[PDB]
Amino acid sequence: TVPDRDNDGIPDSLEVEGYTVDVKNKRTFLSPWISNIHEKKGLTKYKSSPEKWSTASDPYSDFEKVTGRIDKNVSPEARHPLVAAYPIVHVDMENIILSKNTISKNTSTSRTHTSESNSSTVAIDHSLTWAETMGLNTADTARLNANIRYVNTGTAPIYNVLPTTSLVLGKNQTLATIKAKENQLSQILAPNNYYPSKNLAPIALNAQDDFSSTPITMNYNQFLELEKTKQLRLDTDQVYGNIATYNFENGRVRVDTGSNWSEVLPQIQETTARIIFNGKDLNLVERRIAAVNPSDPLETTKPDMTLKEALKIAFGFNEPNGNLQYQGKDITEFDFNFDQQTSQNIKNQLAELNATNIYTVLDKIKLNAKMNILIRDKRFHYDRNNIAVGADESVVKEAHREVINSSTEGLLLNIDKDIRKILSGYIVEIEDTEGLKEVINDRYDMLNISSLRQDGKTFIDFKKYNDKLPLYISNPNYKVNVYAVTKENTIINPSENGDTSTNGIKRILIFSKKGYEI
Amino acid sequence: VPDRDNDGIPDSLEVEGYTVDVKNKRTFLSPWISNIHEKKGLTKYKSSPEKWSTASDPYSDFEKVTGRIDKNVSPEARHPLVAAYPIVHVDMENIILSKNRTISKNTSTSRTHTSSNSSTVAIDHSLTWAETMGLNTADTARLNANIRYVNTGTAPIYNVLPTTSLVLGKNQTLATIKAKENQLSQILAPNNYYPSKNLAPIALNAQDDFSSTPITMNYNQFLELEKTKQLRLDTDQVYGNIATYNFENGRVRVDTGSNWSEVLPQIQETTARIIFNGKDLNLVERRIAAVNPSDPLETTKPDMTLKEALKIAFGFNEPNGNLQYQGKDITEFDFNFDQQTSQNIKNQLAELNATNIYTVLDKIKLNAKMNILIRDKRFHYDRNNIAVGADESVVKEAHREVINSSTEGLLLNIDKDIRKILSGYIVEIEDTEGLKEVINDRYDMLNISSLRQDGKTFIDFKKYNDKLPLYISNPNYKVNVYAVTKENTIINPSENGDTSTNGIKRILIFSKKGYEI
Ligand SMILES: [Ca+2]
Ligand SMILES: [Ca+2]
Ligand SMILES: [Ca+2]
Ligand SMILES: [Ca+2]
């Protein structure tokens, strides 16, 4: 006799008005919101669409979510019916091995995003000719082998199936594509996880795998483009598999063949506001929240969502002092970016709000469906793929204030883990009492001089590239300078005319002490 | 309560007028109330009480207006009188040529429509082809291009992908691309590209779908191609199965019972078709449910006037009771009809005793199978109804916004859509008496206008100079910039051996003295 239009578990009125799940005597109770009681217990005030089995358009009912009768791998924040539960899989390549039909360097992959499937970008180690180390003429062709592992940075787990990925050497130069492995992993890939696990062995990338008798080649021009722009791109799709559903009778999560991720994903993308936020580790985290779509009755059945409330339920912002903030960071320490559509909309709101600064009317900005929003730490500069590649000199400098130990063999400093993410290496030089300068590790591939102690502190080794001897300063009246190189300022390859000196580098003074001071 | 077509909405509501409205937070299918629904900015819906889908498409009248539908269906197809279906054509980004010393040029494609979906690519003419490749009378060139699929319709295709053949000349077919079956686990929604514009395109290698035989091209053929520098891409309508809405949990699952190849024919026989190039200058095709007198079941559909169609199919509105599209009055557009449709409207214009269709617009009845072509009057078009040029005044006005000018070039703010009928610019310097020294004086040295990431056009002088700024012997010498419309651009050397820009139709776009810059 109770109204349950969408036929989940929650009665209409409850969803529209506000509700919450509460355990009393070891038993759960789906109660309506009661400020007296539920506010003190610190439960969450949920609210969903009485006409949508899943407000977020995902394979989990608003009931299964809030109630916990769901696959335990669905991310916490996505237990809220306004937060979408779907997977986000991209490929992480750890290192490459090059050779002619040899060399090997480490590679850092980071997930990317541009204003327009999940794509990741690989950065190959430029520090310590490639063409020489291998013996390459304009007639030879190089082969490619790399180690990779799939990464789920979403809010839902995938099971039976694994995505298709392609390795791209430019704008479209596809070197090899990894087939959509049918069911070669009954093992699960859950949110914030690597397959294969970190403690296990990586996946070997050896050939465009439709016929294992054909390696990944790369003619001399291709190879050179790779050397020129030490970087590959991994474009992964959304060919995830079946969804694991909860059986109300025995509570078993089994991989249902009826529910498939490709039946759902399209709907999610069309009825949610996408927000990407790099507050945790400068990594781009993407979340989707359910927003009203004015021209859609069914989507107007969804609760009204404000930008401020989205940030709280999606990424974890809170107001300890009435002031909104992440982890000790006021919302002002971040930067909002929108596509044209959202841009105009937000502007039209700020218009009808008579407000000039969006940071004040944050709880008054309405999120619609299909909105794309980008929040990123205001301290850093960002590239094409929205990756932290630098910062202001006042920032980078300040990041090296704590000088633990000064030595003629190196420096021991305590550096923010945030800042050290944007540094490419260090440059050491000697400055005579009057004018004379002279770089020691004077190579683009020899900035590789900083080691990270597992006790938080960073160590800068001077004598690394200086023939294993400390600084022989025959005159204790000179200066010892240590500059820093940001990813954006760094050179990864000799210029047009094979120049390999720091002479052409933008550096930031970090440490400048005379000889009698060390 | 009657409901013959059995689609949730009752007979009377559909016949007389209804609207879906959200109350507290629930959808209510309400009978249209003149006063209280109008103020709320709601739309007055009508449909056929005897058609589960008035438009004949695979979505019920009820599903459409209630929002209980694959959210990938176009908004205007949310209205029961606007057909929801896919429109797939192939767009080629660039090709490269060689012999079984390789010319790699960029291409531009436009979906065409003359009196199955088809497009037309144009190969870049800007820097001999037959000589750059040592091609002999008994040689053969191989074709290698990059393409993606475009959905310009109002509904998504899912599993399947259309058969499509590349063609040189009138019927010289160089290659045909298979109709991949269920290999496409991705989605092609309306107004989208496949694959996305941040993933590599699709490769055009083999001439057939199985044999590893490259796309070949004999000598005479390669010449023909060099002479016209354009190819045709014909695509069929073999789309996949259809995504259906499950009321039980709201899941959109691809139904293997319902297939677009069973629906399209119906839509095509029960709708009036309107092509309108207003938005972006491209050919946008829409279908509206129109009455078919000979057909009872079809007479069951709401009467449709031309004026109303434009309102619900494209976005036309009446600010001052005057029909218009985003500022441009309805009078600024062409009306073209196939011989059938023409006669019909000529009749109605007699029974109304009017000679100007622009007046009696709201009294013009649309029937099923009508074909209408509405294009912006300001632009010049070709045989395929593609925007190929403009009136000088329009072209000039589009450049009248100079953000900056110097000796290196111009930084203008040109309409991103207008700049689709300009192949390039001719730069020249003028003597105080009248000498004319053209800087980039070659037919294939016109591509000096790039586009910045902030959407501002920049014309580069240093490009086809000596990579040096523009030097002027006298601050009184005028600096001229001309625009070259597609219709007026040359893609090959002239009769003699002339590659100069002398006989090119140029529109003046800039002309400030040396000291006025
Ligand atoms: Ca319910
Ligand atoms: Ca619900
Ligand atoms: Ca009915
Ligand atoms: Ca009906």
Side-chain angles (χ1 to χ4, degrees), chain A residues 1-99 101-181 188-207 211 214-452 454-467 469-471 473-518, chain B residues 1-177 179 184-206 210-451 453-517:
Chain A
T1 175
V2 189
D4 193 15
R5 280 183 173 194
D6 56 31
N7 206 338
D8 44 21
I10 317 171
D12 299 6
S13 37
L14 279 193
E15 299 190 59
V16 181
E17 301 286 345
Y19 62 98
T20 184
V21 176
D22 191 9
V23 317
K24 292 179 179 177
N25 198 30
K26 245 44 175 164
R27 282 160 270 238
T28 76
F29 292 110
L30 180 48
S31 178
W33 188 253
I34 294 171
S35 298
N36 320 331
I37 328 177
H38 305 129
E39 214 161 359
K40 302 179 180 179
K41 313 179 84 168
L43 320 190
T44 308
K45 176 152 161 276
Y46 300 117
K47 199 177 305 178
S48 38
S49 167
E51 296 190 20
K52 294 186 74 174
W53 188 81
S54 172
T55 301
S57 289
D58 57 37
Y60 308 111
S61 80
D62 300 326
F63 180 74
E64 284 173 307
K65 287 197 182 175
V66 297
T67 203
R69 290 174 165 73
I70 195 185
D71 180 355
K72 295 307 164 167
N73 291 293
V74 179
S75 287
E77 62 268 46
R79 305 302 190 82
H80 189 294
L82 298 182
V83 171
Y86 65 107
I88 297 183
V89 168
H90 65 95
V91 174
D92 176 45
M93 182 189 286
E94 289 172 337
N95 51 35
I96 322 183
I97 286 180
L98 281 168
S99 46
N101 293 7
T102 81
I103 196 188
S104 177
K105 295 289 193 56
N106 276 345
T107 58
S108 80
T109 306
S110 61
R111 209 182 69 91
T112 63
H113 169 74
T114 63
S115 58
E116 270 173 305
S117 58
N118 301 295
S119 178
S120 60
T121 289
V122 184
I124 314 181
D125 196 8
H126 70 286
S127 294
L128 305 174
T129 305
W130 286 10
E132 306 305 330
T133 316
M134 300 159 54
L136 312 180
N137 300 30
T138 317
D140 303 42
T141 51
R143 86 190 317 178
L144 185 75
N145 299 308
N147 278 349
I148 63 160
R149 36 184 47 170
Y150 301 93
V151 192
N152 192 356
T153 38
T155 57
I158 54 175
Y159 275 81
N160 42 11
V161 175
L162 217 46
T164 284
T165 317
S166 74
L167 197 35
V168 196
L169 180 56
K171 304 190 72 178
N172 63 335
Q173 294 190 46
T174 46
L175 309 183
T177 85
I178 308 184
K179 81 175 203 306
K181 296 184 179 181
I188 179 193
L189 174 47
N192 280 26
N193 266 310
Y194 296 87
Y195 179 56
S197 298
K198 288 288 194 190
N199 66 357
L200 276 182
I203 278 203
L205 189 53
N206 289 148
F211 216 86
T214 55
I216 301 175
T217 323
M218 200 194 327
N219 67 37
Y220 195 47
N221 263 10
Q222 285 183 332
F223 177 100
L224 275 177
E225 196 179 14
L226 172 48
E227 183 177 335
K228 200 174 300 179
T229 62
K230 289 169 170 53
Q231 159 182 339
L232 294 185
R233 195 185 64 194
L234 284 153
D235 288 342
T236 324
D237 64 353
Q238 276 182 139
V239 66
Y240 319 131
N242 292 149
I243 296 160
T245 57
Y246 180 79
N247 189 328
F248 271 71
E249 315 320 316
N250 54 37
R252 187 180 296 266
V253 187
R254 199 181 311 183
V255 180
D256 172 39
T257 45
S259 286
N260 176 287
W261 275 115
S262 285
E263 298 170 352
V264 153
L265 286 159
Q267 307 302 149
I268 298 181
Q269 303 177 232
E270 288 294 306
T271 79
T272 60
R274 187 220 306 258
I275 301 176
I276 313 174
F277 179 61
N278 73 359
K280 202 176 178 180
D281 282 345
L282 293 328
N283 306 66
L284 291 184
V285 200
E286 159 181 326
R287 290 297 189 252
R288 282 184 176 269
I289 312 90
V292 176
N293 185 343
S295 49
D296 191 295
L298 183 62
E299 302 309 307
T300 311
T301 306
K302 292 143 55 171
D304 298 306
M305 180 68 67
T306 63
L307 179 61
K308 176 182 173 180
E309 202 63 355
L311 269 35
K312 294 178 54 190
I313 68 168
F315 298 104
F317 286 92
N318 57 5
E319 332 171 40
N321 304 159
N323 293 132
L324 188 56
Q325 77 177 229
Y326 191 63
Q327 299 190 73
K329 289 184 182 173
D330 184 291
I331 185 55
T332 54
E333 307 174 40
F334 299 93
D335 192 34
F336 293 73
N337 283 247
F338 318 86
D339 55 19
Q340 279 190 352
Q341 293 85 357
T342 302
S343 195
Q344 293 303 330
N345 186 330
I346 308 282
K347 165 175 288 185
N348 293 359
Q349 303 200 29
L350 290 179
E352 309 177 10
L353 277 172
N354 299 338
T356 58
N357 185 11
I358 192 175
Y359 290 70
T360 47
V361 287
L362 219 50
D363 48 17
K364 298 199 181 70
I365 303 298
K366 300 306 167 73
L367 290 184
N368 291 6
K370 299 163 190 178
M371 268 196 178
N372 291 20
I373 307 171
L374 183 70
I375 319 305
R376 38 185 201 174
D377 190 338
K378 215 170 188 176
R379 298 183 295 180
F380 306 84
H381 308 123
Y382 300 94
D383 67 355
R384 176 187 195 174
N385 309 321
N386 289 264
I387 306 172
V389 295
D392 308 319
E393 299 198 1
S394 304
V395 181
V396 169
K397 285 180 181 175
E398 183 49 35
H400 294 82
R401 160 161 298 194
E402 280 205 31
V403 182
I404 303 307
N405 176 26
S406 291
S407 172
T408 76
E409 301 185 15
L411 284 173
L412 183 44
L413 314 177
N414 198 30
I415 322 169
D416 287 294
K417 291 311 181 301
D418 286 327
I419 302 292
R420 74 169 292 273
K421 288 209 60 164
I422 68 173
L423 272 32
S424 162
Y426 294 85
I427 287 176
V428 199
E429 80 172 20
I430 307 179
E431 186 186 29
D432 162 274
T433 61
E434 184 194 345
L436 185 279
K437 302 270 197 168
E438 190 164 334
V439 176
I440 305 184
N441 56 333
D442 192 6
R443 287 202 71 176
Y444 77 95
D445 56 349
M446 275 167 33
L447 312 166
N448 200 25
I449 56 178
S450 56
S451 306
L452 186 49
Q454 76 169 358
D455 62 63
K457 308 188 195 71
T458 316
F459 170 59
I460 306 180
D461 187 8
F462 292 155
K463 46 161 192 171
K464 168 151 187 174
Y465 289 125
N466 179 7
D467 300 11
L469 289 176
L471 295 195
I473 319 182
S474 185
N475 185 348
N477 285 357
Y478 302 144
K479 273 180 185 168
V480 173
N481 291 342
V482 178
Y483 304 122
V485 184
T486 54
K487 310 180 86 73
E488 52 174 1
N489 290 342
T490 195
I491 313 179
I492 73 173
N493 208 59
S495 54
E496 285 286 37
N497 57 311
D499 194 12
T500 61
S501 61
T502 69
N503 195 25
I505 288 184
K506 205 163 186 294
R507 60 272 172 192
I508 304 182
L509 198 164
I510 278 192
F511 173 86
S512 179
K513 299 275 188 174
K514 279 179 168 292
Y516 58 82
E517 285 159 311
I518 285 83
Chain B
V1 172
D3 184 7
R4 318 188 183 182
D5 52 32
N6 197 1
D7 68 340
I9 313 186
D11 283 12
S12 59
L13 284 198
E14 294 191 43
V15 187
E16 309 293 347
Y18 61 100
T19 176
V20 178
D21 177 24
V22 297
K23 277 47 164 185
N24 204 349
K25 268 302 188 188
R26 305 170 165 190
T27 75
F28 284 105
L29 185 51
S30 175
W32 189 261
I33 301 296
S34 304
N35 59 341
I36 69 177
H37 282 138
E38 199 160 334
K39 314 166 183 177
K40 295 193 57 181
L42 286 166
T43 57
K44 189 189 176 182
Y45 294 128
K46 286 201 177 187
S47 53
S48 174
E50 305 194 33
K51 290 188 79 170
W52 190 81
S53 186
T54 302
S56 287
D57 60 43
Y59 311 100
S60 93
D61 294 356
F62 178 91
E63 279 169 347
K64 281 181 171 173
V65 295
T66 183
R68 300 183 165 30
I69 190 189
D70 175 10
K71 288 309 189 299
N72 268 329
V73 167
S74 279
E76 65 266 43
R78 257 28 143 64
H79 179 316
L81 301 187
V82 168
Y85 66 102
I87 300 184
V88 169
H89 72 116
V90 184
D91 166 47
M92 175 188 292
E93 296 188 351
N94 59 16
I95 72 188
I96 189 180
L97 298 177
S98 46
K99 48 177 184 174
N100 281 342
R101 58 190 51 175
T102 62
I103 314 157
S104 181
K105 285 309 167 59
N106 271 354
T107 53
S108 302
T109 314
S110 291
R111 206 192 76 91
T112 59
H113 167 99
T114 81
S115 55
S116 62
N117 315 333
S118 175
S119 63
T120 290
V121 311
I123 313 169
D124 200 355
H125 69 267
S126 296
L127 306 176
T128 295
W129 274 10
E131 295 308 337
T132 301
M133 325 151 48
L135 285 187
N136 307 329
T137 299
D139 289 10
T140 38
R142 93 196 307 173
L143 186 38
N144 189 7
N146 292 5
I147 49 83
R148 32 193 52 173
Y149 295 84
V150 181
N151 193 347
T152 74
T154 60
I157 63 175
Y158 270 89
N159 40 7
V160 179
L161 218 48
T163 293
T164 161
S165 63
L166 191 161
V167 171
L168 176 48
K170 297 201 66 173
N171 60 0
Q172 288 190 164
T173 154
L174 312 178
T176 80
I177 300 180
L184 200 197
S185 288
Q186 289 90 346
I187 294 81
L188 178 51
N191 198 22
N192 261 341
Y193 287 80
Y194 178 79
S196 310
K197 315 276 296 185
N198 66 347
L199 300 187
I202 301 191
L204 249 157
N205 298 328
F210 194 89
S211 70
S212 39
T213 70
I215 313 179
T216 333
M217 210 184 321
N218 77 47
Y219 184 88
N220 293 142
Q221 277 171 348
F222 182 98
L223 279 191
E224 187 175 352
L225 165 65
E226 188 197 28
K227 184 202 306 175
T228 68
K229 286 185 177 59
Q230 71 165 189
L231 312 169
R232 185 178 70 173
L233 280 169
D234 297 336
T235 304
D236 70 348
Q237 284 175 325
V238 57
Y239 313 133
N241 300 137
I242 311 172
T244 190
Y245 180 94
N246 202 350
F247 285 84
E248 317 307 317
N249 58 350
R251 181 179 301 289
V252 173
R253 198 175 320 180
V254 190
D255 184 2
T256 38
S258 53
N259 165 277
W260 287 104
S261 300
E262 288 170 339
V263 174
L264 288 166
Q266 307 316 324
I267 305 182
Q268 286 167 353
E269 301 287 284
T270 71
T271 59
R273 170 211 212 165
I274 301 179
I275 320 307
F276 175 67
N277 77 353
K279 188 172 292 179
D280 53 349
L281 207 63
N282 295 21
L283 292 195
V284 201
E285 160 174 334
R286 290 296 182 264
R287 284 194 183 270
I288 306 88
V291 191
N292 187 341
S294 323
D295 197 320
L297 180 47
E298 295 311 312
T299 317
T300 308
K301 291 144 49 180
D303 297 321
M304 184 64 60
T305 77
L306 180 54
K307 172 183 161 187
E308 201 50 18
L310 270 36
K311 284 169 74 277
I312 69 164
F314 295 111
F316 281 93
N317 55 12
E318 317 172 40
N320 309 335
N322 312 144
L323 195 48
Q324 86 183 26
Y325 183 82
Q326 297 192 195
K328 288 177 300 173
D329 188 64
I330 182 55
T331 53
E332 295 182 33
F333 298 98
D334 256 24
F335 283 100
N336 301 265
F337 311 112
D338 71 57
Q339 212 163 23
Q340 322 269 356
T341 299
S342 186
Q343 284 269 336
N344 177 304
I345 300 188
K346 174 154 293 185
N347 280 356
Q348 303 192 41
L349 287 164
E351 308 190 10
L352 282 172
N353 188 16
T355 71
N356 189 219
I357 215 273
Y358 290 82
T359 318
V360 305
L361 212 50
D362 56 357
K363 298 179 185 178
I364 306 286
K365 318 281 195 51
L366 294 187
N367 280 6
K369 294 186 193 62
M370 267 184 180
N371 295 325
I372 304 173
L373 185 67
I374 304 170
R375 38 181 198 167
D376 186 338
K377 290 214 287 196
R378 296 177 302 158
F379 294 80
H380 293 260
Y381 303 89
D382 70 1
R383 293 185 176 272
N384 290 9
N385 281 301
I386 299 190
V388 191
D391 295 315
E392 285 193 308
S393 35
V394 184
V395 177
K396 294 183 175 170
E397 205 60 30
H399 294 93
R400 196 160 293 188
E401 292 178 353
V402 202
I403 296 310
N404 200 356
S405 55
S406 64
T407 56
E408 291 188 334
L410 304 184
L411 184 61
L412 303 93
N413 213 115
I414 317 174
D415 193 357
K416 328 291 184 287
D417 299 330
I418 271 179
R419 70 178 310 274
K420 298 174 39 220
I421 50 162
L422 299 82
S423 81
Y425 300 96
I426 291 171
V427 184
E428 85 174 11
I429 309 179
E430 194 174 334
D431 185 311
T432 64
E433 176 132 345
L435 285 175
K436 307 271 196 175
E437 182 191 4
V438 179
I439 311 327
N440 46 0
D441 202 351
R442 284 195 72 189
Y443 76 104
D444 56 20
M445 294 169 60
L446 301 173
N447 59 331
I448 62 185
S449 67
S450 45
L451 194 46
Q453 68 176 15
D454 60 341
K456 286 186 173 54
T457 301
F458 165 66
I459 299 183
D460 189 37
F461 297 156
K462 312 175 308 175
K463 182 151 185 172
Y464 287 92
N465 198 10
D466 290 358
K467 286 186 181 177
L468 287 173
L470 200 158
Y471 159 78
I472 306 189
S473 167
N474 175 12
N476 288 7
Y477 286 148
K478 292 164 64 185
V479 177
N480 295 2
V481 168
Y482 300 76
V484 192
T485 47
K486 293 185 61 173
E487 49 171 0
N488 292 333
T489 94
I490 321 186
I491 47 174
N492 290 128
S494 302
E495 338 291 349
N496 43 342
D498 197 3
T499 61
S500 77
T501 63
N502 191 31
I504 301 183
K505 247 182 152 298
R506 53 183 74 187
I507 310 172
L508 191 49
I509 265 56
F510 185 101
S511 180
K512 299 283 288 176
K513 292 183 190 178
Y515 65 97
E516 295 195 34
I517 300 190

